[PDB]
């Protein structure tokens, strides 16, 4: 059984999305859908996911951009891992 979340995608562009747009970026299993990415993220960090955009990368993986609700704080979440 493959997992949905592989690991946080941490790059300059990721941090900006984290500080300025309350978004977290993840490397995820390319078989995962936007919905499966949302669910998994909520269950792993106990947050509320608002929107998920995906992209199949030229690294053979799938990258997900997960925006959290205004109730949660990306900066603080990512900072505990």
């Amino acid at each position: 059984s493959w997992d949905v979340i592989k690991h946080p995608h941490v790059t300059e562009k990721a941090m900006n999305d984290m500080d300025f747009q309350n978004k977290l970026q993840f490397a995820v299993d390319d078989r995962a859908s936007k919905g499966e990415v949302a669910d998994a993220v909520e269950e792993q960090y106990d947050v509320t996911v608002e929107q998920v955009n995906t992209q199949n990368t030229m690294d053979g993986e799938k990258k997900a951009v997960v925006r959290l609700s205004e109730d949660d704080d990306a900066q603080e979440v990512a900072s505990r891992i």
Binding site: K6, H7, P8, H9, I81
Partner: peptide, 15 residues
């Protein structure tokens, strides 16, 4: 165990 690992891969991804 899966969590410790996931957090390790996160720390690794963050260099």
């Amino acid at each position: 165990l899966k969590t410790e690992l996931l957090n390790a891969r996160a720390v690794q991804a963050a260099g």
